Amino acid sequence: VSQLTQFGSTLQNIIERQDAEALNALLQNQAAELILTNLSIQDKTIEEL
Amino acid sequence: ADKISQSETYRRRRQEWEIQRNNAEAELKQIDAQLKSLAVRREAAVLQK
Numbered sequence A: 001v002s003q004l005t006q007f008g009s010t011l012q013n014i015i016e017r018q019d020a021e022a023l024n025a026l027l028q029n030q031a032a033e034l035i036l037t038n039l040s041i042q043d044k045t046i047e048e049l
Numbered sequence B: 001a002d003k004i005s006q007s008e009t010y011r012r013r014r015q016e017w018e019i020q021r022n023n024a025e026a027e028l029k030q031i032d033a034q035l036k037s038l039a040v041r042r043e044a045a046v047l048q049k
Helices: A002-048 B002-048
Strands: none
Touching: A002 B002
């Protein structure tokens, strides 16, 4: 049983790291997609000048 | 002689109407480009939205 509890603690640590890394990967996709509109705005500011 | 002086007075007045008409035409022309710049700015705010 104490061996099982040890597998359960390793498993919980894996659970936490998996989803912290899925959020970490998600944020970079959101940042990459948010950048394109800023590029369009800056280019069109040039046309304003 | 007063006939000639009146003639030249009307001619100088007409030249001043060239100064005024050309000034108005130039101001009108620059306003259109101001509108073009604000159209770019307005659709830039749309892209920011």
